[PDB]
């Protein structure tokens, strides 16, 4: 069957094509991007069947349009810094104690 990038318009809503982190789909990404060390009198390989493009952690789901649209919807969740605390001079005056704690984000089951 023919790839659906042939049906994608030049003014589509790209974030709706890649909402979340997804692997590179050469039938969904409408770019003639090539990757690979070319052979003698050769060219970098095409995307269809390219394992190297599939090995990249692509940022197609985070484009500037998508990021701005995300961060406009996430503003509802935020609070405001008390404006009285303009600088560290007052952060060390009104709140003498500082508590430092760390979180770690790895990949795995645990």
């Amino acid at each position: 069957l023919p790839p659906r990038t042939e049906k994608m318009a030049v003014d589509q809503d790209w974030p709706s094509v890649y909402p979340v982190a997804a692997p590179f789909k050469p039938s969904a990404v409408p770019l003639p991007v090539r990757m690979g060390y070319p052979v003698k009198k050769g060219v970098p390989m095409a995307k269809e069947g390219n394992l190297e493009l599939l090995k990249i952690p692509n940022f197609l789901h985070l484009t500037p349009v998508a990021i701005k649209k995300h961060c406009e919807a996430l503003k509802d969740f935020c609070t405001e810094w008390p404006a009285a605390l303009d600088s560290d001079e007052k952060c060390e005056k009104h709140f003498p104690i500082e508590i430092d704690s760390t979180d770690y984000v790895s990949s795995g089951p645990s």
Binding site: L1, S16, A28, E80, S110
Partner: protein
């Protein structure tokens, strides 16, 4: 003056729900449940249904294998623990002649085992509480003496027998 703001809170999936509300449906794609590969996109409604049933059949074969051999999947490594990814046990664990084995068999919805167990209790001369009998009738009446997978009500069926056997019949049983 330091006016500390109030700590607004949200549900765990709230951020995901907002991000999801940000994006519309992809008009040039088949539903998310299918594969995005051109060879694996369904072309027709019957083909789409066939692919979905094939996927579900694969899932059920995997689940059958998981439940039939729990010992190979019991090794938990995930913290926090995930109960929904553990094997499910469908056999009755209590074997002795008591109301405990009976209520366990009612909990597991083993119709034939439950009715046999009740007959055994009656043979041993052990009095069964009213609540256990009500549970047994609930099970039998919902399932019509058939094991969980129409069934027509058969005369003198085990439901009717147990019902006639109760010394005391309350509102729940009727």
């Amino acid at each position: 003056e330091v006016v500390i703001p109030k700590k607004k809170t949200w549900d765990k999936v709230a951020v995901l729900q907002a991000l999801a509300s940000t994006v519309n449906r992809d008009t040039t794609a088949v539903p998310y449940v299918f594969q995005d590969d051109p060879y694996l996109m369904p072309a027709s409604s019957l083909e789409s249904r066939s692919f979905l049933l094939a996927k579900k059949s694969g899932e059920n074969v995997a689940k059958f294998i998981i439940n039939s051999y729990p010992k190979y999947f019991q090794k938990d490594i995930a913290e926090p623990h995930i109960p929904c990814l553990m094997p499910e046990y469908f056999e009755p664990q209590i074997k002795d002649i008591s109301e405990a084995a009976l209520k366990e068999r009612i909990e597991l919805r083993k119709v034939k085992a439950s009715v046999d167990m009740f007959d055994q209790l009656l043979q041993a001369g052990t009095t069964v509480s009213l609540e256990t009998t009500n549970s047994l009738l609930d099970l039998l009446c919902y399932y019509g003496d058939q094991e969980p997978s129409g069934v027509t009500w058969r005369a003198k069926n085990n439901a009717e027998r147990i019902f006639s056997l109760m010394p005391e019949k309350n509102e729940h049983s009727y």
